[PDB]
Structure formats: C-alpha cells, structure tokens
A paper describes a structure:
As part of investigations into the C-nucleoside formycin A (8-aza-9-deazaadenosine) biosynthetic gene cluster from [name], we have characterised a pyridoxal 5′-phosphate ([name]) dependent aminotransferase (ForI) that aminates a pathway intermediate. ForI is a [name]-dependent enzyme from the biosynthetic pathway of the C-nucleoside antibiotic formycin. ForI possesses the mixed β-sheet and three-stranded antiparallel β-sheet insertion characteristic of the [name] dependent aspartic aminotransferase family.
The enzyme purifies with bound [name] and exists as a dimer (ESI†). Residues 3 to 417 were located experimentally; the missing nine residues we assume to be conformationally flexible. Electron density shows that [name] forms a Schiff base (internal aldimine) with the active site Lys 262. The dimer arises from crystal symmetry. The resolution of the structure allows for visualisation of extensive hydration at the active site and water–[name] hydrogen bonds. The equivalent residues in ForI adopt a different arrangement creating a cavity (pocket) adjacent to [name]. The substitution of Met 248 in GSAAT by Gly 238 in ForI also leads to a more open active site (ESI†). In ForI, Trp 206 and Arg 207 which are not present in GSAAT, only partially fill the pocket.
Author numbering:
A (entry chain A), B (entry chain A): 0 to 423
The structure:
Amino acid sequence: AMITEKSAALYARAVEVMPGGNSRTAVYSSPYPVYVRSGSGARVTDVDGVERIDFLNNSTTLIHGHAHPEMVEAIAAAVGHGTSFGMPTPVEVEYAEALSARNETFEHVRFTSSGTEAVMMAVQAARAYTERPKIAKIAGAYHGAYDAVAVNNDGSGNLISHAVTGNPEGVVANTVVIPFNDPEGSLEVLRRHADDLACVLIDPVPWRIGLLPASKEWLDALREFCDASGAVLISDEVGSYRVGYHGAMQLLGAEADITVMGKVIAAGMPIGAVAGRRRFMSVFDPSKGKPALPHSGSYNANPVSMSSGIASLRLLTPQAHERIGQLGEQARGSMRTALGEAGLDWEVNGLGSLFRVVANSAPAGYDSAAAAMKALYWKLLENGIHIGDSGLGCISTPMGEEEIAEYAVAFAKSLGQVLAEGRA
Amino acid sequence: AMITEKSAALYARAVEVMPGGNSRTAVYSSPYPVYVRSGSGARVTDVDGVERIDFLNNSTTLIHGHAHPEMVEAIAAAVGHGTSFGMPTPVEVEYAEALSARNETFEHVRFTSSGTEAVMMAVQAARAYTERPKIAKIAGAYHGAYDAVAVNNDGSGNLISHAVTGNPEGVVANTVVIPFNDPEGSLEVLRRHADDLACVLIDPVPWRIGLLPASKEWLDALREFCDASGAVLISDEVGSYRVGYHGAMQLLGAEADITVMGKVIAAGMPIGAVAGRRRFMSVFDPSKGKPALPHSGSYNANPVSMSSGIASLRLLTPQAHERIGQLGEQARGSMRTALGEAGLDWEVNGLGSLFRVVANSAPAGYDSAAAAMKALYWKLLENGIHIGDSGLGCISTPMGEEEIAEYAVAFAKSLGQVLAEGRA
Ligand SMILES: *Cc1c(COP(=O)(O)O)cnc(C)c1O
Ligand SMILES: *Cc1c(COP(=O)(O)O)cnc(C)c1O
C-alpha cells in the first residue's frame, strides 16, 4: 500500500557514501527507512509526499513538535546575528538562569552539544571530584555512546558486564550494573565497590527496560548509599526530564547531586546540559586558577541552541505540561483498551506525555514479541502514524484531542492487521 | 581605555548559575571575558557596542565569517522545515556526497554533533575493527574531552602520560604518546606496543605544539608502521582540514585510513564527521544485521547542520581557498616584520589561512612568554582585533586586503604597547 520510491532512491545514493546508507543507528529500518522532507506542528511529510502524525518526535526531543512558529522566529533571529562565537553571549546567561530555575538542585549549569557529551562530562566530573574510578549504572539503561556508559545498554537486565566490541577491559572493568527497582540486589553490588565508586548513574524513567518509574524505596536506598559512601548520585534525565515540570527526580520525590539534561530542553537544536549542586560543579570552575576538569567544545552555549532553549522553556509552561500529560493519559488508556479487545497482554507504560507499548508475547505468525511490535510499527506507518519500532511514543504541545483520536483509530486498525496477517 | 561594563554585568549574573560563570573553558579570560552580541562578515560587535575584526572566528570554525548571507538563507530555510527528525532526510545524502567528494579516502562518512564526538567514534571504530586496546597520539596535541584522548593534550612535548584528575588508570594505561616529527623516537614507542595498538591518532598540523606541519619523513614512518602492524591511521583534521582543498593529509602528500572533521565543514552549526575507507567504516553498517559499533545521537545528520554544511562547502571553492591562503601568507609576513622591528624572536607559523604567533621569550616586565602573549591578546582587543590568547588566528572568506592591512597596523601598535608597558 505504501509508496516509498523516493525514499528508496535516496537510500541507493546513501549506501555509496555512508556505511549501510546510515548516519544514526536508531533511525535505520530494514531494508531502508522512510526519509522525510519537512514537518509542521504535529505532522511530518515524507519524501514521497505522505503526511503523517508524529508520535515519536525525534526520539522524544520535539516537545513542541515541528517548526513551532515561536521557536522558528527565535532560532532564525539568532542565526541572523551569528551562529557561534569564540566569546560568551547574553543568551547563554539568560538560558542558564531559565534552566536553573526549574529545580532547586540545578544550582550551576554547563552546556554541551549533546546529551551524549553531557553524560560523559557528568561522569568525568564525578571522577574528578571523588578521585575514584568506578561507576555503577542500571542494567539495561542507555546513556549514549561514551565508552564508560555503553555497557549493558540495550534493555537486558543481565547483571554481568557486556560491552561493545573493542571497548577495552580497562574501561569495562570500571563500570558495574545494578538491577532497576531492586534495592536489596542493588545494595549488594554497590557495597562490594563502595570504596572505589565515583558515582551511581541512573535514569529515573528508563524506556529501554520498560518505561516504568524508579520506586521510592529504590531511590531512597541509592540516595542513602551515596550519602554514606561519598559516591555522586547522577540522574540522566536527557529523555525522562519531561515527565515532571521540575524534572523526573523531583516528580518521584528525590534529589540528584548532578542531573544530565538534553532533548526537550531545546526541543530540536543540538544541546546537552550538566546541572548540579555547586560543590560538584566546582571541578569545572576556571575563575580561581586552572580548573580540575577542563571542558570546552566549539558549539557549547552557542546562541542558536541557547535561543532554541529559551523559547522551548518559555513555551513549556505548567499549563502546557498538564495538558500534554492529560493527552498522554488518554492515549495510554485507549491503547490498553485496544490491546485488551484484540486479546493481547502487552503492557502500556509511561508517565505524563511519554508512553511505551511493551510487547511481551509473540502472536501467531511472529517469531518473537519484538518482531510483532516491528510489524505494528510498519502498519502504523501505513495508517498515518509514526511511533518507535519497539513501541516508544510521546505527545507534543501542538497536539490536541483530534490527534489522539486519530491515533486511537489507527492503533486499533493496525493491531487488527498485524494479527490477521500473522494468522493468514 | 576599553569599556567592558555590560560584559561585567553579564558575568555577575553568570557566576550565580554557571561554575565560575563559564560554560566552555577555552573562551574564559580573567577576570572575565568580553561578551559579544552579534557578528557580520569579518566583524564582531561586543555587548558594549564595540565592533572589532575577528581573526579567530570561533576557534577557526567560521571559515565564512559571521552570518554570511548565503549560509543564513540556507540555515533559516532548513529551520523553517524542521530542525531535527527521527528519520533521515534528503540533505544528509546531499551533504555526504559533497563531503565525500573532497578526498579520495573519504569513501564512507557518518555525522556527529561535534568534533569531540567524532574523534571518540573514530577511536571506537578502530578498537572495534582491530579488537586491540591501545591508542597512540602525539605528545601535546588536543582532540577534545573524550577520556582516551584527553591525555598529554596541553601543548607539552613530555613523553610520560599525564591526564586529567580522575581519569582512571584503566583509561590512561591504554593511551601512549609519540614525539611530533621525530620518526626515530616515534617508532621506538610504537614498536613497543605494536601488537596491542588499535590506532595511531595524529593531527597533521596541531596548533597547540606550534602549528607546524607534519613532515614527509614522519608521515611516511607512521603510514608504514600502520601498514605493517595493522593499526588504523586516524587523521584528526577537525582544526587542520582547512589548510588544503582536499584536507591536510593530502596537502602533505599522505593518506589516512580514517579522517575526523568538523569546524569549517559546516562553518558555524554543530557538526563532526568520521570519513574513511569502506572497510574501516563497516563497523557502523547496520544493513546486514546488528552493527559491530552502534552509533546514534539525537542531532546526527540533522538538516540544519547538513544545510549549513552544504552551503559552507559550496562557498569553499578552489578560488576562495587560494584567496584566503594569499591573505594568510600576507598576514604572517607582516607579523614577522613587526616582531623583527620590535626586537622579538617569536615565531609566526601556519599554512594557508591559519597562523599562530608562538611567543618563546619573556620581554622585560613579563614573568613568562605566555604572559607576554596574553598581554598582546588584550592590547589587540583594545586596538580592535580578536585573536587567541596564545597567538592563534585565521582568515575568513569575507576578509580582503583592508582587513589584513588594519590587522598589521594594530599588531605593530599593540606590540609596541606591550613592550613599553613592560619596561615602564
Ligand atoms: C537521548 C539520551 C542520551 C543521549 O543524548 P543525545 O543528545 O542523543 O546525544 C543520553 N541519555 C539518555 C537517557 C537519553 O535519553
Ligand atoms: C576543535 C577540535 C576538536 C573538537 O571539536 P569540537 O567540535 O569543538 O568538539 C577535536 N580535534 C581537534 C584537532 C580540534 O581542532
């Protein structure tokens, strides 16, 4: 049914100049992905001219959807004054104040060009502050490609370290993993390494292991352990910040030492941020001699990304936050009803404007739950909707009741088609 | 003489929300840096309203200067169609072809959001391809903050490993350093580690150790060593690419296995690139199963950065390249004449549109060569010119003969003031 000829032609060119025609693993699909030309509001038009509602929003980055007029105005004006400089600008100060105001723990901030960089610098900061080597992270959680955190980062709960080909033992031996939401099992691992732990790195709502929130009992156990041991508690909220108006830890009743942010904080332009209590951030301070931790980067705090951020935060009011949460609750409820009516036990998880369909059974005609979910992803594309290929999705502020209603119709239709094709 | 009151007021706000009021170590100056508001062409206007000629251009990023009208048009149009997407776009393919065309070795490309990320991914690729742990880099050369390369990265030629506080031994033990332009001493180190070397990471024209080019004898020794040992030869040209129309290795008569690029390739928007022969890049290919080296990132290949890149490369013609090289030669000659007339032995190095004044003596009244150069940096600011605080500078394509003439007058004046103030 779908026409993807212009996508296929782009792919044929791409494979000659990129490895497998790809520049970002997560956007690839076999045999080739759909390529897109433009977006407006909640919708994206592919290169074959087909307009669809976007329910993933650049991996949850685009909290204000595509080309929001107020963001476009702010970004284009900044571009016109100069894209980047070898000197700081007024907008970096304005934006640091705006971000710092969102949570009491965000006392001092520094900007990067990506969440990947920000996680790296947060880990480096903890290592510099403590002068200890090890880090603990959640088994299965993703934090980007930096080698110390690219360990057990693919959704598995396995507690044995597992890393990318070529990541040396000298790196891997200094990262250990803990079981999400299991305080007892987590403390067993943490206490074995306490003297040597620089940090405990968490995501409070990690999607790859199911998009369930961290529990109070687990957060409290980790906070107490960090206080007793001197390890720094780092909350990577690059993806999960958006669940709360003051971020994810605050929504769940807890405080990080350092928080890593990105994605929605600029809602489409390259950025990351490290924000935390002054003492932890002091490793970066260059004002009283050489810093313990140098941290540069050509685009850090560039005024285009800062202007995107100012506009994103200004649009992300308490009212807007509440509204996209209500739409998210409605979407999750409708998915659960459709799954139930189709005889499927799959979970629908999420908080606020985030959701994930977690396929946990293989219906007839599919070799695995993951293959059935990939089929649902493709059927949803055919039926006018973009979600993730393992069930992730999200609401954007240009959406209203009609987009969520259209999604519900498409979701039920698509599920029926997936199941019928499997039984055929 | 200089009025910096609006800069001081921005700094007073900044210190409350950033560590030492800073987000990028390299742009800090004591007691505070000059803040800037906008740029146009070759000039930048500070927050106090003072327009100066920019001879550093965001650490050599802005090859086309500030807010070039053709770059602004391309970038603003891209922004209007959507800043980033969870799907590939036509412009990533167009830009990959444009970049790949610049050098025969750039067979397959992948994009990142920074040179820092690109260097990290190049090293990871070499480790994945070879399954060996160690890397060799130049003693003193900078490659960004990634921990494996943030070793001996501050201009010193010392051959003993030296790293940032907190970088663990498990990282540092797998990075060794070699003496720039000393084939004999380099091969002594390399041969000690040959069985375990994933890569030899060079910059062919590293500024922090003097902005002298790699010699043919040294490049040949490294190429031969990599061919014999199986280590990957990685050329980090994030800063030095611009010396040649086909990049730095090609200008100097050599071939890398993988080249890292950034800065001028998009001339102001966040980017990096890893480009190399297909076999080395194959670790990233996701088209025939899971890749050996996953590599994602929310802004990879985003259409704003791709459009900046297309426009930057289209403006960077052979004619434009030759012209900025002629202006660079003229600027370097005028600096040497002024230094000679002032009785100073400082070097002026560089190729093409890059230069660096390398202070190597402490004139009367200065505690060090570095302090005298910092004084020259501040005097040049007072006299209407931005350069780096350790002597780095560069030409941009909006410059012509009048900017280089004004620079020469300011440089001679400033040098006289520095020396007279020291003798007073
Ligand atoms: C997106 C994400 C990252 C990586 O951020 P980029 O900006 O894509 O480099 C890091 N951590 C988590 C938890 C994320 O969701
Ligand atoms: C600029 C530079 C880097 C870092 O690139 P960013 O884009 O600033 O992160 C890496 N290597 C070298 C040699 C550079 O000049």
